[PDB]
Amino acid sequence: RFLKVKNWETEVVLTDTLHLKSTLETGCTEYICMGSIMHPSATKDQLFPLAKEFIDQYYSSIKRFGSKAHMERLEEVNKEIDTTSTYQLKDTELIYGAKHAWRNASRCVGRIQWSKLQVFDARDCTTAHGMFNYICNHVKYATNKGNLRSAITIFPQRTDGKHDFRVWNSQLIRYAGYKQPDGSTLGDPANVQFTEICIQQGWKPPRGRFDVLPLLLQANGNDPELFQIPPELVLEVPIRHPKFEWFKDLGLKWYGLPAVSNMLLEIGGLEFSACPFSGWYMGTEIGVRDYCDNSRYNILEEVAKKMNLDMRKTSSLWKDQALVEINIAVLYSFQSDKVTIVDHHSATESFIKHMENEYRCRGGCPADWVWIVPPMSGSITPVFHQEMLNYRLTPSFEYQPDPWNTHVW
Amino acid sequence: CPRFLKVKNWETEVVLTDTLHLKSTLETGCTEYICMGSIMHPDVATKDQLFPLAKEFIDQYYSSIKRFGSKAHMERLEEVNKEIDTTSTYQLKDTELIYGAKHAWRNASRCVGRIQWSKLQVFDARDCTTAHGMFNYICNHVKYATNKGNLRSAITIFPQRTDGKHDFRVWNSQLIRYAGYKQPDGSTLGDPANVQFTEICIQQGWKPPRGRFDVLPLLLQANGNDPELFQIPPELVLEVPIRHPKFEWFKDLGLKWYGLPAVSNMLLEIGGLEFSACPFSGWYMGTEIGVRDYCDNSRYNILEEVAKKMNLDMRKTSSLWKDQALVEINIAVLYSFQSDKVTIVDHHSATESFIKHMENEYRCRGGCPADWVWIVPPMSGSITPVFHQEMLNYRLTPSFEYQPDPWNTHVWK
Ligand code: HEM
Ligand code: HEM
Ligand SMILES: CNCCCc1cc(C#N)cc(CCc2cc(C)cc(N)n2)c1
Ligand SMILES: CNCCCc1cc(C#N)cc(CCc2cc(C)cc(N)n2)c1
Ligand SMILES: C[C@H](O)[C@H](O)[C@H]1CNc2nc(N)[nH]c(=O)c2N1
Ligand SMILES: C[C@H](O)[C@H](O)[C@H]1CNc2nc(N)[nH]c(=O)c2N1
Ligand SMILES: [Zn+2]
């Protein structure tokens, strides 16, 4: 059936037909919705229909469905799966696939940029040193002296499951976290466990609040190896406030490059277990989640002190006041340092425009309202009032297990 | 369906286990291929449809009072079936009515205030026959619930649906709301959300003051008849002038709001019986007024005016001038209610209470249906504990349901 989605602020109604194309599950059923669950829920025979489906939509996308090239490609892939239990994507197909996995990422508010993605083919990589080289080039390219460019580097696909390429870091660039004798945490508490694995492997920790973690890289199923990213490739921003001159004295900084490195890219049945991808930050990612989450840097109280706020009752909204000033500081700092960043008002605006584009040209746009709506000031951004349909389209980015739970040394 | 579903809290790592979802009775709107979790809204019962619905409810009631399988349970079942057989409907006992109303609230997945569910004053108005009688009952409800500012949650329940042509309806979506007036120049005076209803009232005879905060009259339909207008006695309408503890100029914006949130357009469904007029009221969470009523672009839309008086830079969105004004507006709302000693709850306190409620329900009941999209407040979401809490949404009965607007369906006599 055709599905309507309405914006309750503009009263614009869009019609979704694209959802009929989905074949994978969402996790919900007719009687139970799991819209707020973070993580809900090959062989030659499974492999061909998936490959065919993907080849079909690729050739449909270049207006040559059923062409001679198309027929030949299907045949070629058929033979290759027969003979080898897998197949290799053409360069054009790899790039199409990566851009579309981004396009189909229902949890990403930044998708208006989807067709501008620099794709680095790293499928000839065989070793951890090789991976390091490719990752450095990625970081250097994507960083671009502050003028951030979206990029993805794609390492060899899964074969038997015992020879996986994995970036063990959840992101390429992150700050270490340390468990103190007194039981508190120094640095980022989210990375305490990963930091410990790096230490256990030989990494000598400076034990600061913002120590960039080393890369831990696994090539072809082997034990991961440590590498320090050359520091001149790591762009950082000292956080200050345009009004509160005491803010710089908090000693806060963050890195300019958000680069997810723990997801799995799926294209036509093939699985790319190492595919680090990067864009640029939305201010709230740092200002709200990284700094103000209770389980992260957790700075609200200190900031509220410096602002001399009344902090005895919740109803003074001291937390909300402090939260806003921190996010002003993040945006101001990045902007003043000419490092690409987008505020949640601008980002959500662009996303609404993107939705409108996709509905017109594609017949829909899968979107996860729980993730799309920013973690502050929700209803004063346009996505809060936008109905969205969530469904799973392929090619796609998928979660995968942490490598330290499925690896034998 | 799996017998046990797990929900995680990503802040605390606490894992809870849901079994209550197995009692789900109606569709969410989702399927295994699509989720409609952010969709707002995704001829009577026949004898044969009614039997198992009544039995399911009666069983639940007698199970709740630890008399399941008792002689009184079996007798009540037989009496109910006999009534359905002879009359195609049945009547609830007062005890069952009260149980059903409290459970419809307990089951309302979109409500963050459910920690209070077992404390609800239920007014049985099933003997009501006329619009004048409806008015009396509604006035008594408003006075009781308001309690001079110490608000008490309450529901008044009018006669259930019979053949569908004799419905009792409150035409107002809430008992107390402000009028909206569209101007010839395209501007709106008052609350833009209420323009349609306001036009209906005017057509029905209401003389409008044409102000920014005019309390709408009640439009009351009894027994399927044409609806009639009544003015709520102004002394029964508690209102709060909004001022700010720091900004002396804030009171000069001339804002105020009413103290009692009272939903009057929902259908209460118990044991297959449908109560099409069941106005219920509680007390406000500040953000309902400070974020939605005042700051929605399609409502009073005051962010700009507040921003200008705050001397904020408003040329770039990146200054977060909107977020800054939003916080000060919400501070003022909470400060004004507390000062006038009218019950209100801030979004931090309410969401903290809701998490405790949810944990208790998982413990004692096997679960707690919750709609995250609605439970998370419209500002500062992730600094409230609910943002980090996975929730399962499913529909249990007794329940409050949406129903079409009466002016779209009414047959004018
Ligand atoms: C270019 C600027 C971009 C912006 C402003 C942006 C914005 C965001 C934000 C704010 C999130 C939520 C992150 C969180 O809360 O953890 C997100 C998630 C996501 N993004 Fe984007 N993004 C960008 C680029 C990209 C690119 C280049 C890709 C892939 C090629 C991508 C794919 C994804 C995926 C798969 C998620 C979901 C992550 C998860 O489920 O943990 N994004 N994005
Ligand atoms: C006692 C204090 C109460 C508080 C603090 C509270 C809080 C809330 C809030 C903030 C909402 C969201 C409203 C919106 O965004 O439009 C809501 C919705 C709702 N509440 Fe509660 N409420 C209370 C009492 C009650 C009572 C007494 C009932 C019924 C007996 C009730 C049933 C509902 C229902 C059915 C909804 C969904 C409304 C809809 O879908 O439009 N609540 N509540
Ligand atoms: C359930 N969440 C687990 C953590 C995942 C994650 C953590 C951080 C941090 N710090 C930062 C990110 C970056 C997400 C992202 C990715 C991209 C590509 C762009 C952008 N603006 N943001 C992700
Ligand atoms: C899609 N939403 C349409 C508007 C529904 C609604 C509007 C207002 C207002 N103004 C006020 C309410 C009151 C909701 C409510 C009800 C109760 C019982 C308590 C409480 N704190 N809040 C509802
Ligand atoms: C429980 C809930 O699903 C979880 O907290 C989600 C909520 N929405 C989110 N939205 C974004 N963008 N990122 C997140 O990590 C989360 N966390
Ligand atoms: C599109 C979206 O479902 C809609 O704007 C919802 C979002 N969450 C909400 N949450 C509450 N409490 N009240 C609302 O009106 C809404 N509106
Ligand atoms: Zn769903």
Write the DSSP assignment of A195-259 as a string of letters: HHHHHHTT------SSPBPPEEEE-TTPPPEEEPPPGGG--EEE---SS-TTGGGG--EEES--E
| Chain A residue closest in CA terms to B385 | A294
CATH code of domain A16-123+150-160+264-278+348-372: 3.90.340.10
Q: Cβ of B408: how many Cβ atoms within 10 Å?
A: 6
The topology under which CATH files domain A124-149+164-235+399-403 is Nitric Oxide Synthase;Heme Domain; Chain A, domain 2 (3.90.440)
**Running DSSP on this structure, what letter comes out for residue B67?**
-
Segments making up each domain of chain B, as ranges = 18-126+153-163+267-281+351-375, 127-152+167-238+402-406, 239-261+284-349
Please provide residue B394's backbone torsions phi and psi, each rounded to the nearest 5 degrees: -155, 165
Q: How far apart are CA A71 and CA A76, in angstroms?
A: 9
Q: Report which of A67, A88, A66, A65 is spatially closest to residue A77, judged by C-alpha positions.
A: A88
Q: How far apart are CA B267 and CA B164, in angstroms?
A: 13
After which residues is chain A discontinuous, taking C to N > 2.5 Å?
Answer: 41
Strand order in the sheet with B218-221: B169-170, B218-221, B228-230
Kindly list the residues from chain B whose CB atom is less than 8 angstroms away from the CB atom of residue A34. 35, 392
CA nearest ligand 2 atom 32, residue: B105
**Running DSSP on this structure, what letter comes out for residue B26?**
B
Asked whether B143 and B125 are in contact (CB, 8 A), the reply is no
Q: Cβ of A82: how many Cβ atoms within 10 Å?
A: 11
Q: Report which of B413, B396, B361 is spatially closest to residue B21, judged by C-alpha positions.
A: B396
Binding site residues of B for heme b, as ranges? 111, 402
Q: How far apart are CA B157 and CA B171, in angstroms?
A: 15
What residues have CB less than 8 Å from B63, skipping those under 6 apart? none
Asked whether B3 and B366 are in contact (CB, 8 A), the reply is no
The topology under which CATH files domain B239-261+284-349 is 3.90.1230
Q: Is A150 in the pocket of ligand 1 (CB under 6 A)?
A: yes
The runs of H, that is alpha helices, within A337-400 are: 344-362, 369-372
Asked whether B156 and B145 are in contact (CB, 8 A), the reply is no
Catalytic residue selected from B76, B114, B169, B177: B114
Picking from A6, A317, A380, the nearest residue to B331 by CB comes out as A317
Q: How far apart are CA A166 and CA A162, in angstroms?
A: 11
Q: How far apart are CA B267 and CA B273, in angstroms?
A: 10
Q: State the DSSP string of B359-385.
A: HHHHHHHS-----HHHHS-SSSGGGSG
| C-alpha pair distances (Å), B236 with each of A3, B128, B215, B333 | 45, 21, 11, 21
What is the longest distance spanned by two Cα atoms in chain B? 74
Instruction: Mark whether A254 is an active-site residue.
Output: no
Q: Cβ of A90: how many Cβ atoms within 10 Å?
A: 13
Please provide residue B32's backbone torsions phi and psi, each rounded to the nearest 5 degrees: -70, -10
Tally of helices (H runs) and strands (E runs) in chain A = 11, 18
Q: How far apart are CA A241 and CA A328, in angstroms?
A: 7
Asked whether B91 and B83 are in contact (CB, 8 A), the reply is yes
CA nearest ligand 6 atom 13, residue: B374
- Cα of first residue to Cα of last residue in chain A, in angstroms, is 51
Among A24, A32, A38, pick the best mutation site for testing chain B contact (most B Cβ within 10 A). Answer: A32
Q: Which element (helix H / strand E) includes B353?
A: helix B347-365
SS3 at position B47: helix
Asked whether A154 and A265 are in contact (CB, 8 A), the reply is yes
Instruction: Mark whether A108 is an active-site residue.
Output: yes
Q: Which of B38, B263, B300, B373 to mutate to test the pocket of ligand 4 (most atoms within 8 A of CB)?
A: B263
CATH code of domain A236-258+281-346: 3.90.1230.10
Ligand nearest to the CA of B390: 5
Q: How far is the CA of A120 from the centre of ligand 1 (A)?
A: 18
Q: Which residues sit opposite B229 in a β-bridge? A: B219
Q: Is B89 in the pocket of ligand 4 (CB under 6 A)?
A: no
Q: How far is the CA of B204 from the centre of ligand 2 (A)?
A: 30
Q: CATH number of B127-152+167-238+402-406: 3.90.440.10, 2.60.120.10, 2.60.40.420, 3.40.50.300?
A: 3.90.440.10
Residue type (1 letter), A272: F
CB contact under 8 A, B317 and A346: yes
Q: How far apart are CA A292 and CA A275, in angstroms?
A: 29
Vertex B174 angle, CA B171 and B178, to 5°: 100
Cα within 13 Å of Cα(A213), Cβ side: 29
CATH 3.30.70.20 is the classification of domain B18-126+153-163+267-281+351-375 = no
Catalytic residue selected from B76, B106, B111, B117: B111
**Residue A316, token pair as written in the block:** 């003074």
Asked whether B95 and B356 are in contact (CB, 8 A), the reply is no
- The experimental method behind these coordinates is X-ray
Q: State the DSSP string of A1-37.
A: --EEEEBTTT--EEEE-GGGG--S--S--SS-B-TT-
Picking from A369, A370, A391, the nearest residue to B34 by CB comes out as A391
CA nearest ligand 6 atom 8, residue: B374
Please provide residue A390's backbone torsions phi and psi, each rounded to the nearest 5 degrees: -110, 130
Residue type (1 letter), A200: Q
What residues have CB less than 8 Å from A247, skipping those under 6 apart? A239, A240, A241, A306, A325, A329
Among A107, A315, A368, A386, pick the best mutation site for testing chain B contact (most B Cβ within 10 A). Answer: A315
Please provide residue A153's backbone torsions phi and psi, each rounded to the nearest 5 degrees: -115, 125
